[PDB]
Amino acid sequence: AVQQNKPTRSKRGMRRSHDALTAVTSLSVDKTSGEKHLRHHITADGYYRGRKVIAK
Amino acid sequence: MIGLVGKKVGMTRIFTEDGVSIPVTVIEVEANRVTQVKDLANDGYRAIQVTTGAKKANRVTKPEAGHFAKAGVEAGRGLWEFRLAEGEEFTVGQSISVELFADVKKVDVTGTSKGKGFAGTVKRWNFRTQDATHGNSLSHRVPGSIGQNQTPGKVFKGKKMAGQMGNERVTVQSLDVVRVDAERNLLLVKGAVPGATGSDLIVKPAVKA
Amino acid sequence: MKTFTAKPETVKRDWYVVDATGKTLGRLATELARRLRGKHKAEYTPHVDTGDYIIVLNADKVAVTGNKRTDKVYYHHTGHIGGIKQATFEEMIARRPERVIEIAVKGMLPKGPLGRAMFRKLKVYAGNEHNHAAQQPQVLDI
RNA sequence: CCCGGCGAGGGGAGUGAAAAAGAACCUGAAACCGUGUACGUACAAGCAGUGGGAGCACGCUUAGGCGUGUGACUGCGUACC
RNA sequence: GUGAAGAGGGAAACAACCCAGACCGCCAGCUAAGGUCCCAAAGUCAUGGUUAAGUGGGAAACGAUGUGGGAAGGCCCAGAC
RNA sequence: GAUGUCGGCUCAUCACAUCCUGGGGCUGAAGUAGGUCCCAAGGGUAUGGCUGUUCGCCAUUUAAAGUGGUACGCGAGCUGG
RNA sequence: GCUGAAAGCAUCUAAGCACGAAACUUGCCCCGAGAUGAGUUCUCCCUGACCCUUUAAGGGUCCUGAAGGAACGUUGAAGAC
């Protein structure tokens, strides 16, 4: 139910060795507007694959 | 002797003239092309490697393509190996059809069983459930005790607990061969075989005999 | 001055080949362990491996006195509840003849990372042929 | 003056002997938590040190073969009240 | 007598048993109990016997042409067993 | 300055002084079926009525319904008669 | 049990030889080269130019980015992730 000894700071670091985040490998560039965006996602300006999807 | 790799088409029944219904599993055994022959001198054992079916050309890696090109056969969907029983001879590029099972009368079928995922002890190991009433407190399907007192002081290896169930290699032995259809590349075997529809199956003559 | 200590990166190791046909298992093993540890060298250092590489041939022809050929038993536990397995000297020779000499020498070597390293220098073959001619082993009448 | 949401919090400028005295403000210890550098560490079993001890890094030196950090491997070794 | 209030070496580990009483330092020598094929420091030492059971390395009444040694006796080339 | 007590439930694991199955000697062993001893631990080894019961008696099955160790196994797994 | 001495006989045993059980090793099914003793077989890919120096399994710049992998997307009789 509860620990019998205090775990060390070394053990705490070992458990967190798998907690590191992963950054996006790369960002796609729109063919028309040229702005960076997440792959398969619309751009901040409303473009997608150079089609100018709704941006209202 | 050697066997063949086929695909599970489904299950059906065959009606005999004497009013008997035979449950049969339909296995589609396409021609198997031998891609490599192994001998004692080079590999230390005798066996043949075969392939079946077809694979998309653009999805065949260069290392795989070179292997198929050496044998001069079209790429299949996989590679399987069969040991030779000291009396068999085969040549690279040879094609083996379902006629091999013409006079076998009994085969062994192995495949990947359906995956049940994480399964409890009741389902996985046929554990008996505890009382559903009479005061039971949150222990209707729990395993119960898992060991003894201080003396051992541990849980023994191999203890039956909950875990992954299914989705593993399984073999069913001594299945009657009901029909062999060379024209349709079909093999009918009495009874059920492991795996879901469309999965790969390996058929060999019965070892028990 | 300080006592001389062997250096692991400047120690000289030689290659020897030994024939085990007709040799008593225990008496052969002690000599092999002695040379694998380097106890026969004046540069012997307890914390450094100063031994020599030894090749043992005809490991399946070792001899045992008395009735040990059928009475000596090798026990080992697999880790499961059943676990306990055994095999006689005769059975071991038929199945894995190399293990007979290997097991005897292992028990005669020190226990620990260094003792494990020493055991790596022992090559045991059941037959009379070896493929280490490039190392030019020297015949050792032991 | 600048970044920021006419924020919070900062970077300059200026005051002062001192702003690492900026109001969460004299001095600013320890537990505890971080960044950087050197060395060791993914076939090895236990009060974690001690005796022996290679290698590596670095400071020396009229090569002076010493000092400092690290510690592969090895003998012994079951805290305190 | 020892431990208690006593460390060191031996008995695998083992306050009370065996050897022996630690003022400090030494990378010098001789011994005690106990030991000398390898783990593990030192005799694969010398001479004459015993054991074949891994006895050695767990045990009784009792049982048995196992085997070594010793002192006597009965019957025997008038031919014994 | 706390090691929770019988019974049941769930889940077990080992011993062999063996309940069944397997292999043998003797028999006051004709056969069938038994008695007794030796070897053997691979697997198998009842459901109900009464009682909190373990046990026991009783009813009816089974090739057999074995004897013991495991904190008289198992309450940080359940129950609480 | 066979043959057979020690012991002229006898004797399954001392030399030698043959039978003998659900136990033992295999045969059947599954996992399995982290088997650091890290194995074997087949196939595929990469065929630039310079500089510094404590000069070696050394460091750096430019050019180059293959086989393949990963990521992302549509998803599965695969799945807690």
The whole-angstrom separation of Cα B157 and Cα B35 is 42
What's the CA C32/C1' G17 distance, rounded, in angstroms? 40
Within chain B, where are the H helices?
Answer: 40-43, 62-71, 121-125
Is the C-beta atom of C7 closer than 7 angstroms to strand D? Answer: yes
CB atoms within 10 A of CB C102: 17
Is the pair B, C in contact (3+ CB pairs within 8 Å)? yes
Polymer length in residues for chain A: 56
DSSP of C56-119: EE-GGG-B--TTHHHH-EEEEE-SSSS-EEEEEHHHHHHH-HHHHHHHHHHHTSPSSHHHHHHH
Q: From the Cβ of C42, is strand E under 7 Å away?
A: no
The count of domains in chain B is 1
**What are the beta bridge partners of residue B191?**
none
DSSP assignment string, C21-66: TT-BHHHHHHHHHHHHHTTTSTT--TTS----EEEEE-GGG-B--T
Q: Per the structure block, which two tokens stand in for B104?
A: 């076998």
Residues followed by a break in chain C, C–N over 2.5 Å?
A: none
Is the CB of B157 inside 8 Å of chain C's CB atoms? yes
Asked if strand E contacts C23 at the CB level, meaning under 7 A, the answer is: no
Number of neighbouring beta carbons within 10 Å of residue A31:
10
Contact C74, C104 (CB under 8 A): no
Which distant-in-sequence residues (6+ apart) come within 8 Å of B30 by Cβ? Answer: B6, B7, B52, B53, B185
Q: A9 CA, D23 C1': separation in Å? A: 37
User: Rounded to an integer, what distance in angstroms lies between the CA atom of residue A54 and that of residue B28?
Assistant: 51
In the complex, which subunits touch C with 3 or more CB pairs below 8 angstroms?
B
Greatest distance between any 2 Cα atoms in chain A: 63
Torsional class of C8: left (φ above 0), alpha (ψ -120 to 50), beta (otherwise): alpha
Separation CA C94–CA C35 (nearest Å): 28
Can you tell me the distance from the alpha carbon of C32 to that of A3, in angstroms, rounded to the nearest whole number?
A: 50
Nearest Cα residue to B10 out of B204, B206, B202, B201: B201
What's the CA gap between C49 and A14, in Å, rounded? 34
Q: Which residues contact B125 (CB under 8 A, 6 or more apart)?
A: B160
* Residue pair C80/C5 in contact by the 8 Å Cβ criterion: no
Report the alpha-carbon distance of residue B6 to residue B101 in Å, rounded: 13
What is the H or E stretch that residue B174 is in? Answer: strand B169-175
Query: Domain of B185?
Result: 1-209
Evaluate whether C123 touches C130 at the Cβ level (below 8 Å).
yes
**Residue B146 CA, distance from chain mean position:** 34
- Which DSSP symbol is given to C120? T
> Edge-to-edge strand order for the sheet containing B21-28?
B169-175, B107-112, B200-205, B4-15, B21-28, B186-190, B177-181
Is-contact C42 C80, C-beta < 8 A? no
How far is residue B86's CA from residue B34's CA, in Å, rounded to a whole number? Answer: 18
Give the torsion sign (CA, C94, C99, C100, C101).
positive
| Parallel/antiparallel/unpaired status of strands C15-19 and C138-139 | parallel
CA-based R_g, chain A, Å: 22
Determine the angle formed by the axes of helices C97-107 and C25-37, rounding to 10 degrees. 60
Rounded to a whole number of angstroms, the CA Rg of chain B reads 23
Strand, helix or coil for residue B101: helix
Distant-in-sequence, close-in-space partners of A8: CB < 8 Å, separation ≥ 6: none
User: What is the enclosing helix (H) or strand (E) of A13?
Assistant: helix A9-15
What's the CA gap between C91 and C97, in Å, rounded? Answer: 9
Closest nucleotide relative to residue B161's CA, C1' based: F11
Q: Which residues lie below 8 Å from residue A29, measured CB to CB, with a gap of 6+?
A: A35, A36, A37
Half-sphere CA count of B52, side-chain side, radius 13 A: 19
CB C53 within 8 A of CB C32: no
C79 contacts in chain B (CB < 8 Å): 157
Q: Which residues contact B70 (CB under 8 A, 6 or more apart)?
A: none
d(CA B155, CA B163): 16
> Amino acid letter at C16?
Y
Q: How many CB atoms lie within 10 A of CB C35?
A: 23
Q: Are B202 and B171 in contact (CB under 8 A)?
A: no
Name the residue ranges covered by the structural domains of chain C.
1-142
In terms of phi and psi (left: phi > 0; alpha: psi -120 to 50; beta: otherwise), the region of B144 is left
Domain boundaries, chain A: 1-56
Angstrom distance (rounded) from CA B73 to CA B71 = 6
Q: How far apart are CA B91 and CA B62, in angstroms?
A: 24
User: Alpha-carbon distance B75 to C78, whole Å?
Assistant: 44
Contact by Cβ (8 Å): C125, C57: yes
- Cα(B208)–Cα(B76) distance, rounded to whole angstroms? 31
- How far is Cα B39 from Cα B86, in angstroms, rounded to an integer? 11
The CA distances from residue B86 to B46, B83, B98, B177, in Å, are 8, 9, 22, 25
